Design a protein around this ligand. Structure first.
Ligand code: 43Z
Length: 660
């Protein structure tokens, strides 16, 4: 039932005129275009499809579907006599190549006069949906007389010439419904694990992790980010999902760590330049998770940073751990409403103690960090957010929730600094315990170290668990030998002031750990422990891979099979000095003479100019590699607040080992 349909069009910098097939068939004020297309070597800006007034003097009368070589997709809708110049677009909307082949993107653009709405979907993902006061039907642009593929005809000349191919293009004289859109067959090279409108109700995701458990279950954790893609301060929860079939399907997400001071709301965070720094500023949050499995207990263990209400990296108190040390014991300090200082601590059995009178009060803190008085739950009122008034407002919403010491409205509040929490699961990610704060590791006058997102390390020959953390001047490895019950630190100095030194570890051979880490120098650095993490070498650098000056998280595994008869390490990282893009897997072979690594093969995840930021990698039970990664430039200010860009792909070793 499409009014029009064609395919196998090659776009070789030369437009194709389809006026006579299509213009008499455009009818009514609602259209849907479906286009299956490849573009592995796009020009930097190019039109896929144009409808225009091609006459002299009317060069601003046209509709276009366009793309950029950054993977942005968009439309223009312009009519100079109506005074309308609409431009809707979204960065990071496309695939270029996957496993050495051009990906067939499936684009669906709906121009709906009844709802006065334009909506674009690419690869089954809605990338923008905009309602306007004055609707411009694409067939009502004054004086339209050309339909073009691979350019726009303006005043009789080609503009926005494209390189690529349109395998299939269909047009309907209807705005097809959301549900109809979901039945169009896709040829996606990826899938989604977490996604907008799923059970987390977060419209944004960042910071993916992956870990293959001994049962063969693959577990994933992620920041479910509510206030757009911003780091804390914000509302962010830690959500998890697992796959029992080698990553073919994933479970509905659950929370590993969550706060209820603010509602879980699916919000379209504004992307206009004036409002995109809107940031939820009154919520507690979690940020940056890391997962490991314990062979001893069989438990799965998840750590994350915890931010009290309104706190994030740049306002956290850098000179307070938030605990009071009492002879080898650390007690969580509290400040009561109205006091100017912290006159309280939480003792054994959650008893809240007045440090001034050395006497217990009638308040206790339960296992959820909620405030009890004489055994009874105190509540606060929950907040929601809205942009109804034109800017961000955070406001009480009439619902009551348990009063928590991390919350803005609590009677008793923790130190405004960052913490590290842990949770565990006894059933491999089907549910999670209530979180517990880890102790402070660097004394009373030092904020928490920052958890390195991704995987912890479980040593092959012992029961030792290691989580990498970073702080100013050092990596701080957190080490447990009793299933997470107690912890010590091993500090390893690094020659950096204030670096975001995100680090991931591989066990090269028994008791030998190599840690790769992000720096401020444009190179990925590494250091080595030969005593299962007790002590660490000086720092060296990998030449051969580039990052930007500010750096990006790198994920790393030791592969279980030999490759070219040698043991192998796989790294995942952008490889570019310009931005977070040019994503690669790099396969290094270990030289058994000295534990040095020859980086030998680099696989491009997609085009050098397409987004690739934080990433997670794991060897699947069947020896494929699972990659869950941010497919966008998560540093760029133009790419903030994008939905469904954290995506999962499956690769085999033979995919990686061309080329050298
Ligand atoms: O058990 C690990 N690697 C071994 C492994 C994974 C998949 C298939 C295998 F045959 C093996 Cl040995 C750890 C699991 C975590 O995800 C770490 O990346 C490596």
């Amino acid at each position: 039932s499409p009014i029009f349909q064609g395919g196998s069009y090659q776009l070789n910098n030369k437009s194709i005129d389809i006026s006579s097939l299509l213009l008499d068939k455009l009818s009514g004020e609602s259209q849907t275009v479906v286009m299956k297309f490849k573009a592995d070597k796009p020009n930097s800006l190019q039109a896929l499809f144009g409808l225009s007034n091609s006459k002299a003097g009317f060069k601003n009368n046209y509709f276009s579907i366009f793309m950029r070589d950054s993977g942005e997709i968009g439309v223009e809708i312009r009519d100079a006599q109506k005074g309308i110049n609409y431009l809707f677009s979204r960065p990071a909307s496309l695939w270029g190549k996957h496993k050495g082949q051009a990906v067939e993107n499936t684009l669906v653009f709906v121009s709906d006069s009844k709802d006065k709405t334009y909506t674009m979907y690419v690869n089954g993902i809605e990338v923008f949906s905009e309602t306007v006061d004055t609707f411009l039907p694409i067939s009502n642009i004054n004086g339209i007389d050309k339909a073009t593929l691979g350019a726009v005809n303006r005043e009789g000349k080609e503009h926005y010439l494209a390189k690529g191919s349109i395998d299939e293009i269909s047009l309907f004289n209807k705005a097809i419904s959301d549900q109809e859109v979901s039945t169009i067959p896709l040829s996606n090279p990826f899938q989604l694990i977490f996604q907008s409108g799923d059970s987390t109700q977060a419209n944004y995701f960042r910071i993916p992790t992956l870990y293959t458990l001994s049962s063969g279950r693959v577990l994933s954790s992620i920041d479910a980010r509510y206030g757009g893609t911003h780091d804390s301060k914000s509302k962010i929860n830690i959500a998890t999902s697992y796959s029992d079939d080698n990553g073919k399907t994933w479970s509905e997400p659950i929370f590993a760590m969550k706060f209820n001071d603010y509602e879980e709301q699916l919000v379209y965070w504004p992307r206009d330049n004036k409002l995109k720094n809107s940031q939820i500023s009154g919520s507690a949050s979690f940020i940056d998770s890391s997962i490991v499995e314990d062979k001893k207990s069989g438990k799965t263990i998840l750590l994350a940073d915890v931010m009290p209400a309104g706190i994030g990296n740049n306002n956290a108190n850098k000179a307070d751990s938030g605990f009071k040390e009492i002879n080898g014991h650390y007690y969580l300090k509290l400040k009561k409403n109205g006091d100017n200082d912290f006159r309280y601590t939480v003792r054994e059995n959650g008893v809240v103690y007045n440090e001034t009178t050395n006497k217990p009060t009638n308040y206790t803190i339960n296992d959820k960090y909620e405030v009890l008085e004489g055994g009874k739950s105190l509540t606060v009122e929950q907040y929601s957010v809205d942009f109804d008034s034109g800017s961000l407002r955070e406001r009480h919403n009439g619902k009551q929730v348990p009063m928590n010491v991390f919350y803005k409205d609590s009677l008793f509040k923790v130190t405004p600094t960052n913490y590290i929490a842990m949770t565990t699961s006894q059933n491999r990610g089907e549910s999670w315990e209530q979180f517990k704060l880890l102790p402070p590791f660097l004394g009373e006058k030092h904020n928490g170290t920052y958890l390195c997102p991704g995987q912890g390390l479980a040593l092959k020959s012992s029961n030792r668990l290691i989580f990498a953390t970073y702080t100013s001047g050092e990596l701080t490895y957190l080490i447990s030998d009793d299933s997470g019950q107690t912890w010590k630190k091993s500090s390893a100095s690094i020659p950096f002031k204030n670096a975001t030194a995100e680090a991931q570890m591989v066990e090269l051979r028994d008791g030998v750990i190599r840690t790769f880490f992000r720096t401020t120098t444009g190179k990925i650095a590494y250091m080595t422990s030969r005593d299962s993490g007790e002590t660490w070498s000086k720092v060296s650098y990998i030449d051969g891979i580039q990052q930007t000056s500010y750096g990006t998280q790198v994920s790393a595994i030791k592969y279980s099979q030999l490759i070219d008869g040698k043991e192998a390490v796989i790294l995942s990282t952008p490889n570019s000095r310009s931005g977070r893009k040019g994503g690669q897997l790099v396969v290094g072979l270990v030289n058994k003479e000295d534990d040095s690594i020859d980086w030998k093969y680099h696989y491009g995840i997609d085009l050098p100019s397409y987004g690739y930021a934080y990433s997670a990698i794991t060897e699947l039970p069947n020896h494929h590699i699972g990659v869950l990664f941010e497919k966008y430039d998560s540093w760029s200010r133009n790419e903030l607040h994008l939905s469904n860009v954290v995506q999962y792909i499956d690769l085999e070793i033979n995919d990686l080992t061309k080329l050298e």
